Amino acid sequence: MFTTRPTLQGTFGMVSSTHWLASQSAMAVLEDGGNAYDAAVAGAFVLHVVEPHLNGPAGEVPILLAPAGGEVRVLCGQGVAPAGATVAHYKGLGLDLVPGTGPLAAAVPGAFDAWMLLLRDHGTKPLADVLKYAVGYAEHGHAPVENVGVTVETVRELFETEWTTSADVYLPGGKAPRPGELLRNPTLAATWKRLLAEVAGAGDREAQIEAAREVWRTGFIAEALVRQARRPTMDTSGERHTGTLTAADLAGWSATYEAPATYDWNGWTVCKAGPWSQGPVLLQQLALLPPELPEYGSADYVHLLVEGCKLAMADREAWYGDAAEVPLDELLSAEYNAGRRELVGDKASHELRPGSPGGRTARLSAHADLVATGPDVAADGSTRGDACHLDVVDRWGNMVAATPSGGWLQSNPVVPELGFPLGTRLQMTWLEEGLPNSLTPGRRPRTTLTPSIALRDGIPVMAFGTPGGDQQDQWQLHFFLAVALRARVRGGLDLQGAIDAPNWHNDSFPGSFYPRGMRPGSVTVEARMDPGIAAELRRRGHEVTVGPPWSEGRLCAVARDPRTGILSAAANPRGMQGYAVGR
Numbered sequence: 001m002f003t004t005r006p007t008l009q010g011t012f013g014m015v016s017s018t019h020w021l022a023s024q025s026a027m028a029v030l031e032d033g034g035n036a037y038d039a040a041v042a043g044a045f046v047l048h049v050v051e052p053h054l055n056g057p058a059g060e061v062p063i064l065l066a067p068a069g070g071e072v073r074v075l076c077g078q079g080v081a082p083a084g085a086t087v088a089h090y091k092g093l094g095l096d097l098v099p100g101t102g103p104l105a106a107a108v109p110g111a112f113d114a115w116m117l118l119l120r121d122h123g124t125k126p127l128a129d130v131l132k133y134a135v136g137y138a139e140h141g142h143a144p145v146e147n148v149g150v151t152v153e154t155v156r157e158l159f160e161t162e163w164t165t166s167a168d169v170y171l172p173g174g175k176a177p178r179p180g181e182l183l184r185n186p187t188l189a190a191t192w193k194r195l196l197a198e199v200a201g202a203g204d205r206e207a208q209i210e211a212a213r214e215v216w217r218t219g220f221i222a223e224a225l226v227r228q229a230r231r232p233t234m235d236t237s238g239e240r241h242t243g244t245l246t247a248a249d250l251a252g253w254s255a256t257y258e259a260p261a262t263y264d265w266n267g268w269t270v271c272k273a274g275p276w277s278q279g280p281v282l283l284q285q286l287a288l289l290p291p292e293l294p295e296y297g298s299a300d301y302v303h304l305l306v307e308g309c310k311l312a313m314a315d316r317e318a319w320y321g322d323a324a325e326v327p328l329d330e331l332l333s334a335e336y337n338a339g340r341r342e343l344v345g346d347k348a349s350h351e352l353r354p355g356s357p358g359g360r361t362a363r364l365s366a367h368a369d370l371v372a373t374g375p376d377v378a379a380d381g382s383t384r385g386d387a388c389h390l391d392v393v394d395r396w397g398n399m400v401a402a403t404p405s406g407g408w409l410q411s412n413p414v415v416p417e418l419g420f421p422l423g424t425r426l427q428m429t430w431l432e433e434g435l436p437n438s439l440t441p442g443r444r445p446r447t448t449l450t451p452s453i454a455l456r457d458g459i460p461v462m463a464f465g466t467p468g469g470d471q472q473d474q475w476q477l478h479f480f481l482a483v484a485l486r487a488r489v490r491g492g493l494d495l496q497g498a499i500d501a502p503n504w505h506n507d508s509f510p511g512s513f514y515p516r517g518m519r520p521g522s523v524t525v526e527a528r529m530d531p532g533i534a535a536e537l538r539r540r541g542h543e544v545t546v547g548p549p550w551s552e553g554r555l556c557a558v559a560r561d562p563r564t565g566i567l568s569a570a571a572n573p574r575g576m577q578g579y580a581v582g583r
């Protein structure tokens with residue numbers, strides 16, 4: 001059975017990411033004696049340079065780490081809303097939704113501190129050695145994918161007319177980035193060099209990293225961000241607004257560790273970030289499944305999965321966030337889920353139906369209620385396209401999986417003394433009080449960013465993820481199941497066959513991104529899915545959209561066979577960008 005790449009197999013290390021430049025940069029770290037965490041940090045910073053349309057240094061990142069011996073652990077690099085970012089304030093600006101662009105959408109940037117923590121607690125390499133790769137591609141250049149330049153062109157009027165600092169970087173002399181020529185960001189290069197120069201004398205290896213955390217937090221980086229945040233900036237609303245972001249918000253905030261949300265299923269345990277992310281929706285879909293699944297890849301299998309996802313997503317909308325306690329145990333309990341799988345019926349649901357965990361009655365946002373009636377980038381700079389992904393496993397068996405995002409070029413003006421813009425993750429909160437995901441000071445917005453680590457018999461086995469917003473834990477569920485249900489290839493998990501497999505998603509819920517619309521009953525399948533499966537689904541009431549052959553999922557996966565010690569990896573071929581490397 002043909003696969004677009006091999007599921008690579010080896011004994012030294014594996015990397016999977018959404019861009020080959022990042023994968024090979026992370027692998028170069030392993031080849032120089034670094035570990036999985038050293039490698040991820042390096043890959044992450046190259047990812048800022050090579051996918052600036054999908055992430056950036058001022059974005060955010062959840063990291064799942066599975067060190068060889070010990071506990072699976074989450075490192076939360078999702079920042080919070082500013083102290084001054086209240087519903088009342090945003091309501092006072094005449095807003096009904098948080099804007100998709102501009103400084104009002106910016107959470108405290110969380111990703112940088114998170115990488116530094118990972119580097120200092122679990123790394124072995126210094127900062128300079130781990131980010132020379134990014135610096136090199138920033139100052140000397142890299143040949144970009146067509147999506148970078150296309151993204152810039154879409155947002156050109158806005159850059160030239162309004163966000164002129166972004167025009168300085170991305171439209172030098174009016175010239176957008178082009179494939180087959182070297183794209184540079186000399187300012188981003190300078191920022192890291194300066195960071196490295198004023199941290200060099202700070203002491204031992206970790207003292208340097210810790211002083212770099214403070215340079216970000218309180219030094220020249222922080223100064224510039226706040227200054228930019230407070231400059232009146234055109235946004236999606238059509239008015240120029242200012243951010244509430246403050247020197248103190250930055251000075252106070254750190255990335256934190258926490259236990260994963262986990263769910264045992266069929267000999268495996270899937271590990272995710274807590275319900276401040278969408279991570280637990282994957283888990284909820286597992287618990288929804290009966291012990292007896294239909295024939296893999298079949299019309300009954302898909303339908304079952306689509307209806308279960310709708311159920312599970314309704315619960316995230318209703319229950320998930322960081323402005324209230326989330327009844328997660330009850331949502332993953334067998335009693336609750338036994339009740340819920342009965343709601344999966346022969347016809348396709350066009351409704352949003354959250355359940356009542358622990359008898360609690362569901363509160364939905366007015367806008368969510370309203371939207372439930374039953375392109376990548378706009379000229380605005382409003383977007384759907386979301387994030388990168390990066391997975392590493394090393395010779396010692398350490399695993400990481402991270403989905404960094406935010407701080408992309410389309411949706412905020414570049415901070416001129418730094419070279420990158422502020423993020424836009426507050427767009428996923430509600431401007432309504434009393435909700436789990438109410439925009440709230442000191443709270444993370446409920447984020448789409450959702451990496452995965454799978455265990456088999458309680459042993460860390462597979463580290464994987466994908467970008468793509470509200471598709472992230474849809475594509476990953478279809479992926480993970482196929483790994484578990486498909487036949488082994490070369491006596492190992494069929495990672496690439498699972499990735500290659502036709503994939504799908506639905507939009508039958510309010511979307512995380514501005515303007516937060518929904519399409520009741522809507523499912524989208526790749527054109528290579530059997531056309532009789534499409535036929536069955538429409539028969540069963542689904543509003544089926546037939547997208548292109550190679551359009552669904554940007555999956556990454558690394559894996560370790562625990563009995564044999566053999567590392568493997570796979571990557572998504574769609575968009576000819578994602579790539580696995582290893583040996």
